[PDB]
């Protein structure tokens, strides 16, 4: 696991190792933010705030633990504060966010984590503080809701 080695180095004070974690995970954090409809005026800020908090909290992180799930727990909490207030192409991006925005919050978060950033069901469950079975249930609900929405919009 490349991330485990990088995280251990970052926790020991290596800002260059931390920079590599930012390079590896920053796109996926911003993707999630955009999926949640956070304004472009705020996406870069949230992503920055998430990594700055992660850096300062590395002292309380066991580097053997999965880094992405820990990082996304920080990130999602910061995103939740903002996305309630979500407002060329990208008319395409607005369409994606507005469709996902019609999902109830629980199924929106699970589908963004799994289908958009690419987390496994157990990884998403770890981020969300849910059982893996709860995640599997929410995914089913989300897919059913999306199918209807897409049927009605075509």
């Amino acid at each position: 696991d490349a991330d485990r080695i990088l995280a251990a180095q970052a926790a020991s004070g290596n800002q260059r190792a931390f920079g590599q974690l930012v390079a590896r995970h920053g796109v996926a954090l911003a993707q999630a933010a955009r999926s949640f409809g956070i304004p472009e005026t705020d996406v870069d800020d949230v992503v920055q705030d998430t990594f700055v908090a992660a850096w300062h909290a590395l002292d309380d992180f066991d580097p053997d633990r999965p880094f992405r799930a820990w990082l996304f727990r920080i990130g999602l909490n910061k995103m939740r504060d903002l996305y309630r207030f979500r407002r060329a192409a990208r008319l395409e991006l607005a369409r994606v966010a507005s469709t996902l925005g019609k999902l109830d919050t629980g199924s929106r978060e699970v589908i963004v984590l799994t289908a958009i950033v690419g987390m496994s069901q157990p990884e998403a469950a770890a981020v969300l503080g849910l059982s893996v079975k709860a995640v599997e249930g929410r995914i089913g609900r989300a897919r059913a809701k999306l199918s209807a929405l897409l049927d009605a919009d075509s």
């Binding site: 800002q15 931390f18 920079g19 930012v22 390079a23 920053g26 796109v27 911003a30 993707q31 955009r34 999926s35 996406v43 870069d44 992503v47 920055q48 990594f51 700055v52 850096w55 990208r90 395409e92 991006l93 994606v96 996902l100 589908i111 289908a115 958009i116 690419g118 897919r143 999306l146 199918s147 209807a148 929405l149 897409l150 049927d151 075509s154």
Partner: peptide, 29 residues
């Protein structure tokens, strides 16, 4: 609807929009 195909599209759209992440300004902190 083909939910899988749409999610693939959503993933691509959000990613292409998010390529310009600024590692430097994060390091500036």
């Amino acid at each position: 609807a083909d939910v899988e195909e749409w999610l693939t599209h959503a993933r691509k759209v959000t990613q292409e929009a998010s390529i310009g992440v600024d590692v430097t300004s994060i390091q500036e902190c």
